[model samples]
Target: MKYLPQQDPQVFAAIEQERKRQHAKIELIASENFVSRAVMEAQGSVLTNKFAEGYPGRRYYGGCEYVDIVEELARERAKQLFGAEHANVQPHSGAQANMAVYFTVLEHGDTVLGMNLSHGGHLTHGSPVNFSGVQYNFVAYGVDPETHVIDYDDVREKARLHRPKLIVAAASAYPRIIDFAKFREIADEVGAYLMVDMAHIAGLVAAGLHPNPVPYAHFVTTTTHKTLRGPRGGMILCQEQFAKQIDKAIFPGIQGGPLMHVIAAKAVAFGEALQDDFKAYAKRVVDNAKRLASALQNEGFTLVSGGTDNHLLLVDLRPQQLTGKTAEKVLDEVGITVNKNTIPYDPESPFVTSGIRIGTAAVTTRGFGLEEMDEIAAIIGLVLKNVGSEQALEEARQRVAALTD
Candidate 1:
């Protein structure tokens, strides 16, 4: 969603050129993905003209019948897709979805157990820089240094000791499948509400590639985009009992008019997810990720925890004698896009770090599978090998275009 300068034909042509670029290259960004035409159409639909300030049948704006139907469709499809008792499609993003849950379940300064931001947890889980840390009490945990996986025993131990009001099971760069049931068990041991933030795995959860958190956690939140592959938006699902508070939190607590257009787009994505092709697509997302990760590893890149169980993988670039920022520039020069990221316990700052997070969701959406993943990984390997050499970079660039096209 961008526009070119002054509506000049030359400037506007760059926009189409970028689209060609994306079609020609791999989009490995973890939080980004392509959406179906139906989703894009719904997002740009007439529903955007309405100002539906509340839930269906109770909105402040007039002439909301069509809008109400659209919102309700989004809501029902979401709850059905995840098997949750309730759904709120109004959250603007995953961060806000987390906020809506906290606003409903916890009082100010209430204690909770969450994963640390540096160790794969999200900012909303409680980085001092985020409002979650400023407004509530958070006891953070991280994956094992040895296993690079969440230690359930450690989680339960911490839960038993802290007695937090809620327990948030989540991750950002974590490469393994989250055990939602285990998080629930730990929550039960301490009499805490288990809130699973499966934002990164929403599409996997929807397509049943990963386990859905509905049956286990008391509250579940996810972004409708990412793995879900809709327009950028957030959604929250909970047991029947917590619906009212969650709804109020999204309305009076944080927002005004709901984004009906995005909600409509979510319905389109949910419908797509229900189709047989989406299940096949979902499986391919994981398969392609595993392929890419394995290919990278064969070239001696040390991936976080050795591999992935979902759509994304994290590479510890330190072993390749390159910083994440350096890798990003090299990859970008070769017409391959990637983002620099901080590895767990990374000594460097996030802006220039030792890791690059990669995912297959975007490329999978573009119709790439294991074969393209092999070529993509090879090109990335070539780019990384030529760290600072301009001539070497050009060769890698040509190889990437040839391999991809």
Candidate 2:
């Protein structure tokens, strides 16, 4: 920040404000986490000045030797951490990671089976507004209405009818374990390739806190952020047979040059993931979520499923007659941050959804456990139950400040 402050005072001031915001706020966003100091160091390194347009030893540019080392280290560590035969540490984001997979295998207008967006799947998982649905025919399957979980029967039915070339198995807001083996079985029955988007659960998978999708799927895509606690970027893992195709698709097919600094940060994060402490952190993330979900239920809030088995939970606010939008704003006012999200078969529009998504990855990384989760849940109950009362809001704000401070 030395040169930055002197060169551009306005931008530096804004960055400083943001730094304070991160330090002061309670981050409950499911898709966010705090990366380590080592990760930030790598991301802020001199490697950002490179223009490596291709994979290691085969780059299209000169002066890529150092960047080549950074990219190779990222690839090797990703392969080791995920237990994959090959890894591609490119693709700018999770959306691009998924797009690269589709580009590698499917023709335009090819059939693919994926979870419905409103049912907790990502937009890239085939929402009509995205390039995925525009270019390919995407058939969607969703959670069972009664159980609020994936209905394998419905997915199988869709597969039989559409005979899709690929089946996507992943979710952005699902709170339970994904049965990758069952997904593999259905894909095998239909002779379709299986690609899992493990963006939200990569750290859990790496620590064996959740089932690993790499052993069961043809390809796996993940964001380096979220539970992975790395810089914001994307990665792909696949078997050796599809490695070259995946690499080519990410490079010449979609992107030009890779971000070497981000790749270096990814390598640093992966190296940290290889440690025993990361496993404990992943476990605590789930533990905190479960505790928080239970406490919310105790406060008379309805969870999407009965509870969560992972690091996030979707709370249906209907029992208290609260809109997700109102709840999101109120909680933000009280200094606790969460996102309004669509629940399975939500009756309201996406803009004013029936539920809010909460997660423990960021708070757990910040060292909050079950006791803190219960306290936070109680605080949410107090604020949301009295959204328009400034007096009640002030009390809740003080409690939140105490916890965050």
Candidate 3:
């Protein structure tokens, strides 16, 4: 911070503003979380000056002994946290993590089955606009219309019909536990490899709050941020049999030099996850989600799947006769951050959906507990129920300030 302000006032000013903004607002974005000082310090360290292109002890560059130690720590810690046989911590983002998995097991234009985007899947899970969809023949399975939970029967049917080369399990917006066992069964029946994008729930899995996918999946990919509370990066976990292929796919096939600083930060974050406190933190994240969901329902807002078994939930704003866009704008005005999301069977287009996704990880990271969650739900209700009322908006803003303070 000292050097940045003296060297580049413009960029330093923007970073300062972002820091203040994070401190002042109530963050509810499902894919976001605040990293600890240790993680941040690691990311800001001299490791960034290194450019180790390959795995530890076998790098493409010279002077990699120390970088090798850092990378090995990241790889080993990731394996321990997830109970995987092999771990690749090089990919720069979750998208790249997913891309590498696809690159390893799939051929171009091969049929693959994944969750429907509108029903909680990510873009890398084969959205038409993404490379996954363009390169692979991606079919979709969806959640039940009424229950809003993944329809295993539909997944089986899709797998049987498509005879896909791969079956993807897990989602970005899903609020319930995914049945990795069922997914594995269907994959075995179809003679397909099973890949799970556990990006959104990696922390829960690490804490043993959610079922582990490592045993049931051929490949598992996740981001180091989100609930993991790490620097921004990605990782891939696989059985020992496929370790070489997965690593090669991520390096020579997709990327070149690994981000050594971020990898160091990932090791620190994984070390944090191994502690007892992170388990309690993950539990509170889910507990806060449940409290907020029930409180929102009491305010007459319908939630997808009735409630959540995870750290996030989808609020169907249709019951309140509101679009996700309008709700997002009003909440932002009151110092709350959330994203408009498409719910299952949404009548509106993706750009202007009928639901918003809210999460508790970041707020919980800030030490907000059940009581604060209730107040947050109440504030959201106040803002959305009276979007036209300046008095109501002002009240909500004040409540947000009180909670953040």
Candidate 4:
């Protein structure tokens, strides 16, 4: 693909400008990351042109032998990385994986319990607008308002009341490490299936830095990017009992063909996860998260659950006399980027949320260690404390650059 400078400057410039834009910011977004050069190499490979319409060896096309190997390698690495019985490295994104899981696991309109979106849950959890809500009968269990944590008693109460066919255990902005084993036990008691969406913490789990949800949850879905730091894609892992159904759902029920290049990229990422150094990377990720959380707290920001348990936390901006949107905008102005999020029992709407969710996955991916995170946290403090001052924003920008250097 030659750069057609004269003909497509608009599109090319937009892409290049975004690359520069992200490179300049101190990214604190929880669900985003920068992959390795090897991952990028696989992403930009010729595998993108292939149309291997089926699983690895059983493809529906000729000349798919190489594509099959790449896909199979990705699958094997994924299975080993997460300790799952079977792995499907083909969902286009985390959302698609969620949809496929729903299609494969539940009957139409069957009752299910999922985390509520405003209570740190993802769209796939139980948003009325999402396919999970549209196609299946859903009841939501949210974090305890008083504690800013998932109330297991409440979840079990809801489970017994609903008698749902499925239970989704996942979150987008949750601060605590979810008790997947508890959920698994509850699911077994209720004779329901447990599906955990590990999209946010797959990389942490990859390095054994977080709880292994794959073992407890009947099915686990994750994006390849975010913490895993691979391609912009997703995959699903489940027991072999449901493998065929899930794979078919992803291929035909979701979309026609998989993005082969992204699958190759996933293989690269899983291979990276296998290295001893990746364990250090994962540990740094956790250290950065803990350091940032502590630093932010000492500076007077109120973390939703008082603090984080994993790699991210939600800051209840109301206590700081700020809205999530206001804080997010101020941080953005200073080149420290994080998304506004709704806290448990949020009074304000999603657009103008009451909390800001911050994570260190992206920053840690760029080789920023705990010392750098401490500095980064100090800059964040400056951003929130001096929320309106342009001078302070500029100062934070310089500090961010200092971290980069």
Candidate 5:
């Protein structure tokens, strides 16, 4: 802020350092993206001062008229963008958004079918550490061992055997298109409700780049950040029949006062996503991912699921005899940032896995196209292959600086 220099020197200096780090580094984190100024402005607006403890026009508290209008705009835009019968933009994060759905539909100890976390699924899906797993009995379905894609037959068999009350169609680290229709069929066959967590690929779905789950899944949840490029928050999209219950679950069951400023930011980002340019950006995001995947393959690295159909690619580093921890750190030292990830059926633990997940959304948003992707692949190969060599790392650092500059 303009007053931060005088009022809060320490925080201001820290923000300045973070701003520099963001520009200096090549951000390849799959779940992160730089939001637009309009989105940031709305998030930092006077609306943050308000406490709107309910949905638009039905608040439990007084003085919510203006905040009500902002929340309504967010909900309407979200519905229009996703083609859902109803939208709830109040849940604070994707996990809580998912919690609302489970609370609305399922009782404690009921059986639910979901994807496994180490195999491209989210924690809220069925990770034993998460509430979803602790409160409900979860049956897992995962990718094929050889192909690294979801095995629909396996999912179907599990669904039939478990006869769960709900089935979650999950998306987190998956690089290929998700078959929501197939999940819907399995859910229907087992008399289960289908809920999709499209937090990672909502922007692509909105642009019609990835298959839309809105038509098939009974409930869909997403974070406003990631590919959607909004402020950090969560949203839910569902049918008219479940709208009231979903609202109540999010309010009384999970969360209290909604962040009005962040809701305003979500509205701004949703409006941006509805434009033609955002569609083009989504396409570029995928193209860049494919280009980078190919370049990395040419460097003799193995990719999980063979290649990506969207903005992310998961690299299995065993060919190079490298741990993802070393690769992530080496890449970080070279100013090319990425995260250590687990390959499906990984030999190592989650803390020291066999893979690194790369995404193009952030760098693509920074104007890196096919050419830059090629250069980035070169940087990754150079650093990863010689992770123990300081001389090689220094050279890679120069290359990264040149490319970034």
Candidate 6:
């Protein structure tokens, strides 16, 4: 901070503004979380100067001994956290992590089955605009219309019909526990490999709050940031049989040099997650999500699946006669950050969906508990129900300030 402020005032000013903004707002974005100072310090370390291009002890560059140690720590800790046989911590982002798995097991234009985007799937899970969709013949399976939970029957039907090369089992916006066993069965029946993108629920899995996918999945990918409270990066976990192929795919096929600083930070975060406090933290995250869901329902806002079993929930805003777009704007105006999301069977387009996704990981990290969650839900209700009232908006803003303070 000292050197940056002195050397580049303009960039430092913008960064300072962002820091203040993060402190002032109530972050509810499902994919975001605040990293600890240790993680930040590791990410900002001189390790960034290294460019180790391969796995530990077998790098493409010289002077990689220290970086090799960092990468090995990241790989081993990730394997321990997930109970996986192999771990690749080189991919730069979640998208690249996913791309590497696809590159390893799938041929161009090969059929693959994944969750429907509007039904809570991620963009990398075969959205038409993404590389996964363009390179692979991706079919979709959707959730039940009424329950808003994934239909195992529908997944099986899609797998049988497409005979896909791979079956993706996790979601970005889903709020319930996924049945990885069922997905594995269907994949086995179809003679397909099973890959789970557990990016959104990795922390829950690590804490044993959610079922582990490593045993059943051929490949599992996740982001190091969300809920994991790490630096921004990605990782891939697989059985020992596919480790060589997966690593080669990530390096020679996709990327060149690995980010050693981020790897060091990932190791630190994994070490933290390995402790007892992170388990308690993960539990609070889930508990806060449920409390917020119940409080929101009491405010007459309908939630997808009636509630949540994890750290995030989708608020169906139709009961308030509001669009996600309007709700997002009004909530942001009141300093509660959230994202507009498409709910199952949404009538509006993705750009203006009928629901918003809210999460408790960031707030819980900031030490907000059940009572704070109740107040947050109430504030959201106040602002949304009276979007036209300046008095209500001001009151909500003040409440947000009080909570942050």
Q: Could you say which candidate leads in lDDT?
A: 6
Q: What would the TM-score be for candidate 1 when compared with the true structure? A: 0.94
lDDT (0-100) at residue 160 of candidate 1? 88
What is candidate 2's TM-score against the reference? 0.99
- Pull out the clashing pairs in model 1: 120-172
lDDT of each: 0.87, 0.93, 0.94, 0.87, 0.92, 0.95
Please provide, for model 4 over 1-405, each residue's C-alpha lDDT reduced to its tens digit, 9 standing for 90 to 100.
Answer: 375557799888898888888788888889888888899989888998998898877888899989888998998988889899999999999999998999887888899999887887888876788887888888988788788889898889999999999999988888888999899988998999999999988888888877999879888998988888888888999998989899999987888889999899999999998888888888888888888888888888888888887889888888778889998988877778889998888889899998888898888878888788778778878888887788988899888877766
Colliding residue pairs in candidate 2: none
**How many clashes does each candidate structure show, in the order listed?**
1, 0, 0, 0, 0, 0
**TM-score for each predicted model, relative to the true structure:** 0.94, 0.99, 0.99, 0.96, 0.99, 0.99
- lDDT tens digits, residues 223-285, model 3? 999988888989999999999999999989999999999999999999999999999999999
Sum up the clashes in candidate 4: 0
Task: Single out the weakest 10-residue window by summed lDDT for candidate 2.
Answer: 63-72
TM value for model 5: 0.99
> What is the per-residue lDDT of model 6 for residues 1-405, given as tens digits with 9 covering 90 to 100?
779999999999999999999999999999899999999999999998997887899988899999898889998999889999999999999999999999999999999999999999999999889999999999999999999999999999999988999999899999999999999999999999999999999999999999999999999999998988888999999999999999999989999888899999999999999999999999999999999999999888999999999999999998888999999999999999999999999999999999999999999999999999999999998999999999999999999999999
lDDT of 1 by residue, 30-124 (tens): 88898888899898887888888989998877899998998999999887788999999999999889999998889999998999777788888
Is candidate 1 or 4 superior in TM-score?
A: 4
For all predictions, the C-alpha RMSD in Å is 2.3, 0.8, 0.7, 1.6, 0.9, 0.6
RMSD of 6: 0.6
Once superposed on the true structure, which residue ranges of model 3 sit more than 4 Å away at CA? none
Once fitted onto the true fold, the runs of candidate 1 whose alpha carbons sit more than 4 angstroms away are: 1-18
